[PDB]
């Protein structure tokens, strides 16, 4: 039966039948957004949903027999597996993010269609060349985030009161979002010199970030 089904899985129909379901279930998830629509056709799309989830596991089952070890060494397939798994955890118990993480299946449209895969891949492959920078920066953030927790945390605990909080605040300064009126000016009402901490921090982080962008245009 193997070659029989290996001809079902590889079929242009089967793959395009999947793509057809993704665009359908996607359309169906934007409808589940409407409180109004749920009062009309709630039960329609709840069944239609459970339906698709089976179809996608049947596929991922069929997909596994045909590929065996090759399937659990394919990024795109591994993905597809995990995104269906999440979609399998019972409509109850534990966390309810799992009910929300179910919308992650529409990322299969990125998997089941090339060019998307191409472009996603094109994007990802730049990451390794950045890891050298990304490491530098994380050490940098970690260092300043400690100083800040221990320099501003007592008077300004919302923003720097915890190592995590300082990370968040520092991230926020880095995106330059409301950084002066929102943070440094307040801080300076108490700590006149806080500008000595954040201006250098901004230069560095802004400089480094600019280099990272030119690095991705040297290749």
């Amino acid at each position: 039966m193997y070659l029989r089904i290996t001809n079902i899985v590889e079929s242009s129909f089967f793959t395009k039948f999947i793509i057809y379901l993704i665009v359908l279930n996607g359309i169906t998830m934007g409808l589940e957004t409407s409180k109004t629509f749920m009062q009309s056709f709630g039960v329609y799309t709840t069944l239609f949903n459970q339906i698709v989830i089976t179809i996608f596991t049947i596929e991922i089952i069929l997909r596994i027999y045909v590929h065996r070890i090759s399937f659990f060494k394919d990024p795109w397939s591994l993905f597809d597996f995990f995104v269906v798994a999440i979609s399998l955890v019972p409509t109850s118990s534990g966390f309810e993010i799992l009910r929300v993480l179910r919308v992650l299946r529409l990322f299969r449209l990125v998997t089941a269609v090339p060019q998307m895969r191409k472009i996603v891949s094109a994007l990802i492959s730049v990451i390794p060349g950045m890891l050298s920078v990304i490491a530098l920066m994380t050490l940098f953030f970690y260092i300043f985030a400690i100083m800040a927790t221990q320099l501003f945390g007592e008077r300004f605990p919302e923003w720097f009161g915890t190592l995590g909080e300082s990370f968040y605040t520092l991230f926020q300064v880095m995106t330059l979002d409301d950084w002066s009126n929102g943070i440094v000016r307040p801080l300076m009402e108490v700590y006149p010199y806080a500008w000595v901490f954040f201006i250098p921090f901004i230069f560095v982080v802004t400089f480094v970030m600019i280099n990272l962008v030119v690095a991705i245009c040297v290749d």
Copy 2:
């Protein structure tokens, strides 16, 4: 009469006369802005406007004879038809946006002068080589916009209460506009972990956009 008028339309005088109307009507439309100017010369400029609009249809009526099917396959020509057409819809009924859309005719200064034509074209030609990335993002946006509507829209309906609103809010985060003090710090007063949604969201969307710019500095 065809070759006669094919020599009127195609003349340098015709074109340079058209350009002369645009820059004149453009000046007249900046004057219709002043409530003062309208209490003095409102009559002058309302007539002058209908005048140019006649002249512009006469010209477009002419232009079509000289080109027939070649005209309706020219982007720039199609444009002027549509833009004059909007200017044709009566100063009444329906919407008043049509009254406002009339100022779109000043885009003819782009259509009826080269280099502009060159520059616009230069720009537009970059779009197809973005469609792969653009598609990716619009799916990403759609996915999170759904996720966000169902994670935050009950307590925070202004921002995420509706699919559309999530799109708007997510766009705003993407432009990094007042995203932390304005939206996420609030959101975290109720959902401490909201930072787990927006920081990843920000990297992805920021990353991708850096590539789309590096892509345009390659082709």
Copy 3:
């Protein structure tokens, strides 16, 4: 005496003496900032200033005889003339900006010291190859500023009340500064569809500006 003075002017000492004055009058102007310093050395500096102004008009007079027509065809020289000229308008009558505009003479450090001239020129030289874009944009800004004044200026006259005001608001949106919480969300409380005007505006204006930068990163 002409070759005597052409040997005075063209001398290294002359140039290095001018540069020496600029850095001194520059230092002396940062001191006229202090209300404290002015109460202890106000006169010291005001005389020193009137002094330097002489020394620079003497120089410019010398400089002119040595170059005649070659001078009023040198940008950098013209500059120095006009900048010193400003410094010549009496401490009274007229606008008081001319008193403030005096500090523009410190830009002579750019003009009278090479490598600044180089870098400045290097910068300026990029402007012509942007005039095509810059014109495009200005037309665009002009067209939308008109639309916005007649779409939003009745209920929102601070922001869009006048054609000039619209320009400013539109500039602000383009620098993406507090555009959503600060402007469009307000505007939407009245004009729900205002988002239809500002999102496309942002796309266009942001797109164009990316091209203009990639344009520069090619020439």
Copy 4:
């Protein structure tokens, strides 16, 4: 005893041992952040902290006998000295920022591990190609900072009342952070024409910065 210790210092186990202490002491400093943790294992830490500092001076002492003058001509080696030095100043007295500055030793992770060294150096090496532009800007900032202090500092002394404040505010406009609703719109409630000062300032500063970025995308 020299070649004995020269072989100890140059040993891989020596280096790897240091890198081990850094990643250990880094983890220790992040724990000193928890107010909870210090009530539990503060003592455990503070003594381990002094231990590491002992070890690190010993290393730097060893490293000097084995390099002499070659040491104090090595940037990285100099760094480590001036970093451990900081950590040597007692837990008491005059500036307590020194207790905070101790955390700068985590930058030794950059100094000891290569690749980081590589990347940091790659970053630094872009600086000299910017000094021509940096100097230009700093002169620019200085000139406008002066004009502003004397144009706006009487009514707006928070923002422009002092040369330093003008510098800060001008930096903030440059990062485009809350520059219009936050600052210029206010300023215009008194000085209608303040837009004549800041829009040009923004262009220049924005333009320049774009060139500096492209200038890097060359070298």
